[PDB]
Every structure is written in structure tokens, then in C-alpha cells.
Amino acid sequence: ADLALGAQVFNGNCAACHMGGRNSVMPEKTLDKAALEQYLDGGFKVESIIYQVENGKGAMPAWADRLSEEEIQAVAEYVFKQATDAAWKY
């Protein structure tokens, strides 16, 4: 999908906690492929990330009220793309 929009959305909303694909609230739950396979409900799939973005999880807020449907799909695919290619620079 729109990967340029995904970065804009990730950069303006998610980076407060996932700077560099890291996790400042919970160090272990990072945005790396292996963290995702291990800690994200549903595993490493775009769908699992979308679900977690819209409904939140614990200290992670829900985004359904703040982002649009297309923004959620974009950010999810962007995060997916980053983990696959292991492109997170921290």
C-alpha cells in the first residue's frame, strides 16, 4: 500500500514509543521480526499489526479514534516492511 504515508504516520504518532523500532515502555516488545513473532498476538503478519494498532494493548493506546482506516493499513504495512528488511536504525 502507501508506504510514504505509512512513514508519515509512524513518524508522527508511533515514534514517541517505538523510536528506531524499539520500545521505551517495554524494552522486550520491539518492532523486530523476532520480537513480533514472539510477542505480538497473531504473530508476524500485517493483519496482526493492524489489529493491535486499532484496538491497542495495555500501555499501547488504541488508534481507532485518531487515525483513518487507510492510515492504519499504511502504518501496519510500513512496520511490516521494516521488520522484514530489518531496516530499524537505533
Ligand code: HEC
Ligand atoms: C507508547 C505509549 C506507545 C505508542 C505511542 C504506540 N505503542 Fe506500540 N507498543 C507499546 C507497548 C508498551 C507495546 C507492548 C504492549 C503490551 O502490553 O504487550 C507496544 C507494542 C506494539 C507492537 C507489538 C510489539 C511486540 O509485541 O513485540 C506493535 C506492532 C506496535 N506497538 C505498533 C505501534 C504503532 C504502529 C504505533 C503507532 C500507530 C504504536 N505502536 C504506538 C507502546 C506504544
